[PDB]
UniProtKB/Swiss-Prot annotation, chain B:
<feature type="binding site">
    <location>
        <position position="36"/>
    </location>
    <ligand>
        <name>L-glutamate</name>
    </ligand>
</feature>
<comment type="function">
    <text>Ionotropic glutamate receptor that functions as a ligand-gated cation channel, gated by L-glutamate and glutamatergic agonists such as alpha-amino-3-hydroxy-5-methyl-4-isoxazolepropionic acid (AMPA), quisqualic acid, and kainic acid. L-glutamate acts as an excitatory neurotransmitter at many synapses in the central nervous system and plays an important role in fast excitatory synaptic transmission.</text>
</comment>
<comment type="subunit">
    <text>Homotetramer or heterotetramer of pore-forming glutamate receptor subunits. Tetramers may be formed by the dimerization of dimers. May interact with MPP4. Forms a ternary complex with GRIP1 and CSPG4. Interacts with ATAD1 in an ATP-dependent manner. ATAD1-catalyzed ATP hydrolysis disrupts binding to ATAD1 and to GRIP1 and leads to AMPAR complex disassembly. Interacts with GRIP2. Interacts with GRIP1. Interacts with NSF via its C-terminus. Interacts with CACNG2, PICK1 and GRIP2. Interacts with GRIA1 and SYNDIG1. Part of a complex containing GRIA2, NSF and NAPA and/or NAPB.</text>
</comment>
<feature type="binding site">
    <location>
        <position position="38"/>
    </location>
    <ligand>
        <name>L-glutamate</name>
    </ligand>
</feature>
<feature type="site" description="Interaction with the cone snail toxin Con-ikot-ikot">
    <location>
        <position position="11"/>
    </location>
</feature>
<comment type="similarity">
    <text>Belongs to the glutamate-gated ion channel (TC 1.A.10.1) family. GRIA2 subfamily.</text>
</comment>
<feature type="binding site">
    <location>
        <position position="43"/>
    </location>
    <ligand>
        <name>L-glutamate</name>
    </ligand>
</feature>
<protein>
    <recommendedName>
        <fullName>Glutamate receptor 2</fullName>
    </recommendedName>
</protein>
Length: 48, 48, 48, 48
């Protein structure tokens, strides 16, 4: 997922609710918090 | 027995009710749940 | 790996409720991200 | 300084005290906090 951070031509997403979405939102890791910012403002929706 | 609503179940925000399969262990409609029940904090404090 | 306690002792319930609160907040991950990679002589960037 | 983060064969440092050292220690930016971790555990000392 470190290489999903630095390569944003591949679109990664999660489900609309669940513990998987709630993991990145409260995360304070340098990899995962940046991976939540990319989920935060990407349209068409990566959240399925 | 299969849980009826088909949810793993989490605490409702307002009514503070449990639904789903943890709703069967706390409220006593079954005695044990061998199932994909993810260990969390909100589920530790009600069932062991 | 588990924090151990003598059998039947009073630190059976709050220690158990503490660890699942640490893994919830990611504080176990941020302490595992640190002592294995902050104090790392050759980081993944370093060989990279 | 984003390219000083991802390339650690060049050694960057600050002075032993002052507002420049105190900026990275309290920083909560994804670039600058990682640039303080590299200052934190690098010997011979980058702090002059």
């Amino acid at each position: 997922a470190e290489d999903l951070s630095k390569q944003t031509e591949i679109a990664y997403g999660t489900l609309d609710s669940g513990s998987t979405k709630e993991f990145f939102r409260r995360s304070k890791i340098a990899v995962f918090d940046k991976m939540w910012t990319y989920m935060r403002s990407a349209e068409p929706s990566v959240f399925v | 027995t299969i849980v009826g609503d088909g949810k793993y179940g989490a605490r409702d925000a307002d009514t503070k009710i449990w639904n789903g399969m943890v709703g069967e262990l706390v409220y006593g409609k079954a005695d044990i749940a061998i199932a994909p029940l993810t260990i969390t904090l909100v589920r530790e404090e009600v069932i062991d | 790996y588990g924090i151990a306690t003598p059998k039947g002792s009073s630190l059976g319930t709050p220690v158990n409720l503490a660890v699942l609160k640490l893994s919830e907040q990611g504080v176990l991950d941020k302490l595992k991200n640190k002592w294995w990679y902050d104090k790392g002589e050759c980081g993944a960037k370093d060989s990279g």
